[PDB]
Amino acid sequence: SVLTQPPSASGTPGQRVTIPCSGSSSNIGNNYVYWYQQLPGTAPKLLVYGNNQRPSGVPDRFSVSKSGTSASLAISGLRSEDEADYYCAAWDDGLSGSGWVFGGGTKLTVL
Amino acid sequence: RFASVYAWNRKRISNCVADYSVLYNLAPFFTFKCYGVSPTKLNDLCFTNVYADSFVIRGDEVRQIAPGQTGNIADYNYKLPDDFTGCVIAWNSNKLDSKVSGNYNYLYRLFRKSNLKPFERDISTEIYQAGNKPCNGVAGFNCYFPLRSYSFRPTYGVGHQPYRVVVLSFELLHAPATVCGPKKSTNLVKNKCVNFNFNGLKGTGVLTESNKKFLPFQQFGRDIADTTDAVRDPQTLEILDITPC
Amino acid sequence: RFASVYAWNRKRISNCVADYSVLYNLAPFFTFKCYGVSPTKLNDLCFTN
Amino acid sequence: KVSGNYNYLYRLFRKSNLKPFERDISTEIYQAGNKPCNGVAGFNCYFPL
Amino acid sequence: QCVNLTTRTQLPPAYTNSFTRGVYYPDKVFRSSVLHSTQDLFLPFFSNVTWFHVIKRFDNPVLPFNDGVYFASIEKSNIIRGWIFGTTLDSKTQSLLIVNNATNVVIKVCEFQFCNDPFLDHKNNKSWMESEFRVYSSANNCTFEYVSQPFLMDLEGKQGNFKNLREFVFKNIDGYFKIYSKHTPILVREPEDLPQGFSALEPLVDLPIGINITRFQTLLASSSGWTAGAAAYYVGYLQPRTFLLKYNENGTITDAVDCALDPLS
Amino acid sequence: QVQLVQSGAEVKKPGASLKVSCRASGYTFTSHFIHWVRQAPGQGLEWMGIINPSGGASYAQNFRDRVTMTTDPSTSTVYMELGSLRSEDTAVYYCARAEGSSWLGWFDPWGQGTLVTVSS
Ligand SMILES: *[C@@H]1O[C@H](CO)[C@@H](O[C@@H]2O[C@H](CO)[C@@H](O)[C@H](O)[C@H]2NC(C)=O)[C@H](O)[C@H]1NC(C)=O
Ligand SMILES: *[C@@H]1O[C@H](CO)[C@@H](O)[C@H](O)[C@H]1NC(C)=O
Ligand SMILES: *[C@@H]1O[C@H](CO)[C@@H](O)[C@H](O)[C@H]1NC(C)=O
Ligand SMILES: *[C@@H]1O[C@H](CO)[C@@H](O)[C@H](O)[C@H]1NC(C)=O
């Protein structure tokens, strides 16, 4: 609930779509952030982790960046399989507790 | 490996050039507050002696190391004096000390017959006595084991992660110096109104030569009005004499 | 008669001065251990209820 | 008592762990299986008290 | 050397008036030709200093410690070596051992356990050696360890005309141990009491123990007749006082006054 | 080659108990921390907690007091016991592994997902 994400995203094929994730010092201001993509009827996959390295078996077209205290993920060459829900994760520490908070999510689809 | 709070380790630091820039630049600091000095003015003064304490305490009690407080970590383990100098550098260390299984290598004393004067230590672990009849063997009713172990988990929030703490205490300008920040010497002149900086003692005057004998355990002379008027050149061993323009 | 385990009785204790010293000076007491605070300083703490 | 004090009972089987600080007693019979049974002991039915 | 002996002829220690001894430099800054007022722990003027003598009789009891001690030794044969400081001296609490016999001044803060009096008569037979050096049965865990250059030594044995007169003051303030020393040679005071003079001690060491100390006993090294150097050591206790001190033109102390003894003062 | 298997679950009454198993193979079991996560329909994701393969465990503070862990480093199984359920806790559970150092790391394995629901 602390992590803020756009309610939904969309875009024409062949365009470039940028998705933000804005937190605070506790969530993003100190440590790394992860990005997660979920497909209908599928287990979650990995898009960016460690913020400076990309896993194996994934295209490097998924561009990532950190803008101060926010994360940004830009996608080019959109296709049908891109339709997915995107979350941002970051180990957060709070005055009452601490945890592995996930982002609200953003439904990305084409009509 | 940091010490337990009740058996903290005190370290000497002598004959070295001290640069605090490589220290204060640490972004993940949660506190850097200084009493007798300002944090940004520690790069031009020479200290007579420096001692760096160390321990690990629960996050809630990091406020309790300041002078004039009271509690179960400010009177039974480690108490600072009322006229403290130097300053404390506290930061969160949840990544290292805490463990998922439950860290059990950090203790603190609960029961003591009386408080302790500042900077005292007690490794003794004899059974505390609460009843009229003394006990022996194992503790229990009316007599207890004096030490209880902290329980650190990553689950717990602020107030229960271990804030690593290191405290620097140093006397200011009362003895020959051994440690201080970088500077470039600029020779020596006599009978010419200059701006001298002898071991952080700024001023203005002309430095003649003097014949007053300094005992081996002294560096600064003084006069009636409590103003320095004779210094020992740090590089050579000549005894100078400061008089106003 | 004390209430059984399944229906342990709860009593309200407030607006009173509690002296644990007289309670602690009894003969047949066997087990007495505390967790929240030090059991030797129970006469200096104030609680809402 | 020498004659036998049998007024204290404790619970063996319960549906799930009780909410802490509860003062409610349920007289419902525990069923090992999904099918409800009552009255006399039968298939997969046993007294939990 | 550790034999059940008992037969402790603990003669009551005697009285003397510590006339003016025990004063010291309070501040480490040079001054000249001025009178300065200080407020510290001092040995009061004309106080009942307690005198012990070691020769058939022999003693070394455990004396109380309460806010510093002035210790003055008259000795020529080098029979009193070191000190033990602690609260229980029973290997359950940390304790200081100070020894400066031959090699170096050694100061060790550690758990120590002690016997009654390790010796045979004083030493067998006429030449020093290593024997029963295990004056520590063990030491579980401890921190401090210090070695430095020894103090002045004594060569050969001399009866009477004890030129050596050592005087130390030990003071414990806020986890710091302050030891001030002063050795005055050529003392010809044959009769008894400490000389009617003046000597301000100088700082010797100021080191961070950070322990609790309350008692101390000095460390010292056949049918009838034996040759042993007579040693006379005096112990005095310090009180919180205010002094007025005079510095002469050279920067050394000439005389001090205590502001509470006499209305004249 | 490497994959985690869970137990298929069906409808449960509110206030009941659930024992969910997690069997892992193809890698050294006692080398990686275990994350359990829960996803509710029409919402984001919430991680249940973290488990050491041989030892205790830690839980999110909001979901504490009702979740119990037991480990068995012999047949490579990890269990959840859940109690005091409600109709609003119907969700899907995943059992996954992480890097051997916990916290910041890569999460290649993931849970197959088991559904829990209340209906009549
Ligand atoms: C240093 O140790 C001594 C002796 O262990 C402590 O003296 C105790 O003082 C209290 C209060 O005056 C008495 O109730 C005890 O009986 C004393 N001990 C003994 C063995 O009699 C002294 O308190 C300690 N220092 C500190 C700061 O606690
Ligand atoms: C041995 O020591 C004990 C101490 O309790 C003493 O009573 C006894 O007299 C000693 N024995 C001799 C022979 O001195
Ligand atoms: C000090 O010594 C004198 C001389 O014997 C004696 O009369 C007096 O009682 C002593 N005072 C104390 C406090 O011991
Ligand atoms: C050593 O000398 C002492 C006296 O100096 C004497 O009492 C003791 O018996 C001697 N020991 C041996 C083994 O000669």
Numbering used by the authors:
A (entry chain L): 2 to 112
B (entry chain B): 343 to 587
C (entry chain A): 343 to 391
D (entry chain A): 441 to 489
E (entry chain A): 14 to 68, 75 to 240, 251 to 294
F (entry chain C): 1 to 120
Copy out sentences from the published article reporting this entry, exactly as the authors wrote them.
Omicron (B.1.1.529), the most heavily mutated SARS-CoV-2 variant so far, is highly resistant to neutralizing antibodies, raising concerns about the effectiveness of antibody therapies and vaccines. Omicron is the most heavily mutated variant to emerge so far, with more than 30 mutations in its spike (S) protein, 15 of which occur in the receptor binding domain (RBD). To delineate the structural basis for antibody-mediated neutralization, we determined the cryo-electron microscopy (cryo-EM) structure of a prefusion-stabilized Omicron S trimer in complex with representative Fab fragments.
Substitution of G446S disrupts the hydrophobic microenvironment, substantially decreasing hydrophobic interactions between Omicron S and XGv289. Consistent with XGv289, the substitution of G446S alters the hydrophobic microenvironment generally established by RBD and a group of antibodies bound at the right shoulder, including XGv289 and XGv282, triggering a conformational shift on CDRs and disrupting antibody recognition.
